[PDB]
């Protein structure tokens with residue numbers, strides 16, 4: 599463990615202490631049932647337990663609103679059936695001595711029209727059968743990926759309804775809260791991660807391009823009001839399960855779905871100071887753009903405006919993560935692609951062993967291929 603000593607240091611995170619700072623980023627793999635969104639335990643339990651040596655595992659984006667799917671077959675955490683399977687998966691990770699937080703998501707305008715708009719639309723279930731977002735602005739010049747599309751081929755995103763302030767406060771927020779309770783109190787997760795990134799609902803209220811709301815506490819007119827939904831959701835979840843079991847993820851420069859803010863630096867620093875009072879377990883962020891267009895020193899922005907645990911992500915390797923931790927710029931680094939391809943990523947870091955190359959074209963097969971078929975070193 600001489601090559602990356604800083605990366606292998608333990609870390610106090612919330613009410614826990616990580617064995618190392620090699621974190622497994624949340625990765626949607628679509629291994630849940632399509633209709634009920636129940637985790638397919640047979641494959642998911644193995645997948646997660648095989649990666650349980652990670653300092654912390656952040657489980658893939660999981661639905662908080664019934665049937666509001668964005669990835670067609672992702673997991674949910676709203677039903678008893680989902681809770682039970684997650685419970686078994688979590689227990690498996692815990693038997694290996696690992697830690698695991700569940701990422702909570704609401705796809706917002708990235709919801710799949712052909713599925714959501716097919717659901718029933720009753721008065722007792724006011725949010726059902728509807729596309730919901732901050733503003734009625736559809737994702738443009740970007741179609742639904744074949745691996746997420748209901749038909750299996752690229753489909754068009756739809757124009758979402760503009761959530762009223764009451765629907766946000768009494769409809770959306772409570773779902774995140776209940777999802778957190780289900781995850782922690784019933785399934786046994788060590789914590790939850792609020793998905794405030796990658797163009798989904800919370801991020802959609804966060805950045806200018808998707809939030810043009812004219813009035814209300816979530817107006818798109820000012821940085822503070824755009825930060826409010828992320829804060830309110832996070833705060834209410836903290837009220838329910840304890841801030842030391844709550845993390846938050848953001849991506850100020852991620853251009854997926856055409857997301858963009860004209861002043862990412864000011865926005866990020868403003869959010870950091872706004873959540874500073876919550877004493878969260880951690881703040882998780884993408885330091886760059888998945889589409890390689892937007893640039894900005896997110897690591898520096900966060901380092902100078904947030905005193906809590908900072909988890910950075912995006913195109914990191916052991917050496918760089920180790921160095922940034924050494925310099926105190928970040929506390930830990932979350933790896934996505936490398937964890938998909940290396941169940942024993944941590945062990946490889948300890949021995950400075952080479953890594954399996956990822957097969958980026960097999961990330962969403964929904965079968966064992968490209969999911970549970972990556973070998974550990976020399977096996």
Ligand SMILES: Cc1cc2nc3c(=O)[nH]c(=O)nc-3n(C[C@H](O)[C@H](O)[C@H](O)COP(=O)(O)O)c2cc1C
Pocket residue numbers: 623624625626627658659701793795796847884911912913914932933934935936961962
């Ligand atoms: C197949 C796949 C699924 C992903 N699923 C999620 C997700 O559910 N939630 C999320 O916040 N990010 C998700 N991401 C983004 C990753 O968490 C991570 O930020 C990204 O892979 C960049 O990090 P890397 O360079 O270490 O791979 C996903 C990425 C991939 C490639």
